[model samples]
Target chain A: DLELRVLEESDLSSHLELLGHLTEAPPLSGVELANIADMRRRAGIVTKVFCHQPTGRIVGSASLMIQPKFTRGGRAVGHIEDVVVDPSYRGAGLGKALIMDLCEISRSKGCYKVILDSSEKSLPFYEKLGFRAHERQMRLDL
Target chain B: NLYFQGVDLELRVLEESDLSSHLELLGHLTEAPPLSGVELANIADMRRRAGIVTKVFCHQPTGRIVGSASLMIQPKFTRGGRAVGHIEDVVVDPSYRGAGLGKALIMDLCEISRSKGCYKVILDSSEKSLPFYEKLGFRAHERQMRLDL
Candidate 1:
């Protein structure tokens, strides 16, 4: 069995390494990193991780962003943001577990719906789980 | 030693007190495609209806306001229960770059969620801040997707 939990401040360094590997981004200096983590904690959003037992290594993760939008039915929605799984840990049901946790958070938060944008690479994963692409996004960066 | 140093740290709601600085900060940032005032106002209105809480961070040591973040909680139906916090617009003053103040500020917000019994927190982070957050253990839950109206 795997145990999943909200990431704590202590996980910042490890998270940096994981993100660097995944996104090819540089790591933040101590205080800068700390402050960013601070921003996230204060915002009440977080990156979650799933740990393997005994060894206790984080094998998967996801960023949960609550979109707080007015639902057509006059309510709110909990939107998922970035979600990732270590290639080494793929197919272990970790991603599914993480999404379930996301759903749990949505349910607890009184969100009637949970929505997300799926990457083409990960589209099947989301579709298999019952999320269909409903919208497209565009940008003109200045 | 952490917070007691007349380090001069203070916090206030992100209100008119820092409007100039706030606008200045916005001015300096790499610009996003400007939204029409109406678009901006509509977003704010939507958030307000959904209970979005916005906050600003200040550093006592420098007598400057350096950071800000907003949390929006909305009700969702057709799922389980119905509520979530959308954390957004996080930025730190460029001058006060390397301070742990931001982390402290964020933790304070988490405290609010824990106390209010919030179920989950979420945000669509920029590419720059994404790693900082990732290092903090936030994974890409949905791999950066959005819809432009």
Candidate 2:
């Protein structure tokens, strides 16, 4: 059974291991994750993780960051980021499930809209979820 | 007198009292419906706890908000404990377009991101404004997708 829920401090290493399949997840100390958990929690970052219950390992994850904006009469907005499914578990709709959960959470919080930046290859996936390509992302790296 | 194109303009974070001015400034970017003062204060409190910074450019002499922008400091577990800055809600009054308020507003938020130790700052830009942001040292990157709930 796979249980999806909020990211807990206990899922440290397995969480990073899961993200490794999605991007360049480097070695991290367990201490680093717990040290800043409080700050991230307070920021309204709802990071949902799908745990392989029998194995006690995280296999899928996504984050919904709710941002309160002065626009739209003080309604909040949601930014979805860092979504990934375990490479070994790709075909079972884990990715779609994870994203759906994030959207539902965003809607529940009164977000006027939800947005995300998708790589070229990932465009079609979000399209199936009723997301439209609307704007270009501009970045300035420090 | 502090001047932006020969008129006084100053930038600072939004306060509870600036609720009307705040909503008014945002309307320059989009249609803004009426929001109660109590609702505005609650929104401000929610943003503060979330580490989001909302800044506005005000016409000092008249006490009117002329521009508005925000920086969202999102704490990331990756990036070796560093965070990312998201610049959002950037807008300027129609009459104040040539006053450099838009440029001034973005630069301040970028500086705030630097002060906060963000490794990068990002925003969604329109095709029309691509050139404008280029002048501010931004480069084209990924595609921004949206889902209207």
Candidate 3:
């Protein structure tokens, strides 16, 4: 079994390194991170992480950033991001569990929808989780 | 005249006082919630400090709001800490459609995103409205998947 919980400051080094499995990222300064994490918590952004029980090493992570809006009569939107599992932990259903927890968290927060952008390759992973193809994502790279 | 057609019309950061009108204009886009103004205020204060910027357009003559949009800046732990903008809740009063108000609202939000140094701006759009967003310089990207809660 793996340990699952919200991200905490103690997981700083391990957490950023785990995210390296998702994309290239430079580790942040401890002082700098505290500031960002402060606003993140205030924003209701709960980042989830899973760890290996034996060594207590972080092996998976995802973020659920809740955005409050004036639309939908003022419901919040839950946006999931940076979802990744260590290569060694892949194909063991760890990813599914991580996401399901995020969805449930969204529900409890009264979110209108839990949404994320998916590449063609990851389409099936999210589809299996009952996330419909609601629409197309558009981007304007600055 | 709540469009670029007039000089007085402009997008401004939404405040607690504009909550009622802002919520009403959003009803034009979907069903309105019964959330009291006081309840919404509590959420507003937190988001304002959380890098979420919501803008509303007023009908100047009567000081009533009729259009709204928002750009939420997410500071990345990736991409060298560059920010990404999520543009959402684009809406205009039904009677004000086709008067360039919607485009104005979107354009302003895009500028706000870029102004804040966001590496890019993204939003989910229905297939039928794909061309509309394209006209504003947005390109079709990955699939936007949703899990309703």
Candidate 4:
């Protein structure tokens, strides 16, 4: 009954809302908006969503990082990032559907592998979708 | 081949037997988001299947694993749209931190990435790691955001 769509520039607010809810970072403001705009001109690509036929509320989001290096062996790989579904939509099968849609984009884009970083809570979700973690990732805060 | 018995250190690839020590290193590597043993094993298997090369830095004084890293291929894309290799998931021990061991690991990975014809080597690095990777000629172009569900 619902539908998925690519993220348009005008949906910035909804996109930011998804980020603010999922991450604990402070909300982005005017200056940050300008910053995001500046960075977006490059590879800030994403796909967004809306519920179906009538109430068109933004409810899902996903993006891919297309590294030029992904197309060496024979296929391109677009690493998927910022995948989020509306909390209310969790039990609905929307998550897998969204992922499959994203994979379709990757497939069309000539990507071979789609990588991502997921929190512990979502590892099970990703594993269900064929993701397995191997590396021990570390971050030194600035 | 060489042998150094009782030297207290052994350098080699991380094997399934090293899981516990690797888990300990991972625990120190992050806050509380360490991957489970199954997840770790799964990743290792993926790397092996993908033909990724791995390296380790032994303590030379302790048989325990002191540091480790992987120099794998990131898929490469050509004008015709194909696959290639890239360096990924470089890690070292905290006790062995600042000793240039991590850098050595990355450098080795880069050589492999380059040799494998990777268009470029990329990594999602933390700010603190920014300077280190930057010194090695890596640059940051955008901020990667995540939404925890």
For lDDT, the strongest prediction is 2
lDDT of each: 0.56, 0.84, 0.82, 0.56
Q: What is the lDDT of residue B114 in candidate 4?
A: 62
TM-score of 3: 0.91
On residues A44-133, what C-alpha lDDT tens digit does candidate 3 reach at each position?
688888987787788998899987775665678889988999999889888898999999999998998999999898899999999989
Model 1 Cα displacement at B78 (Å)?
Answer: 33
DockQ of each two-chain model: 0.05, 0.73, 0.65, 0.04
DockQ score of candidate 2? 0.73
* Predicted complex 4: DockQ: 0.04
Highest DockQ among the candidates is held by which one?
2
Interface root mean square deviation per prediction:
14.2, 1.6, 2.0, 15.2
Best by TM-score: 2
- Tens-digit lDDT track for model 4 on A73-112? 2234566755777787778887778777776777777765
Ranking by TM-score: 2, 3, 1, 4
Residue A72 Cα positional deviation in candidate 4, in Å, after optimal superposition: 2.7
For candidate 4, write residues B1-149 as lDDT tens digits: 23323244444676876755655554444432445567667655655654556666566554466666665443311111112333554566666667676776666656666665555555667667777887776765433323221
What are the C-alpha RMSDs, in order, of all predicted structures? 14.7, 2.2, 2.5, 14.3
Ranking by lDDT: 2, 3, 1, 4
Model 1: fraction of native contacts: 0.08
Off by over 4 Å in 2: A21-31, B1-4
Q: What is model 1's C-alpha RMSD? A: 14.7
Model 1's TM-score against the true structure: 0.48
TM-score of each model, in listed order: 0.48, 0.93, 0.91, 0.47
| Shift of residue B128 alpha carbon in model 1, Å | 30
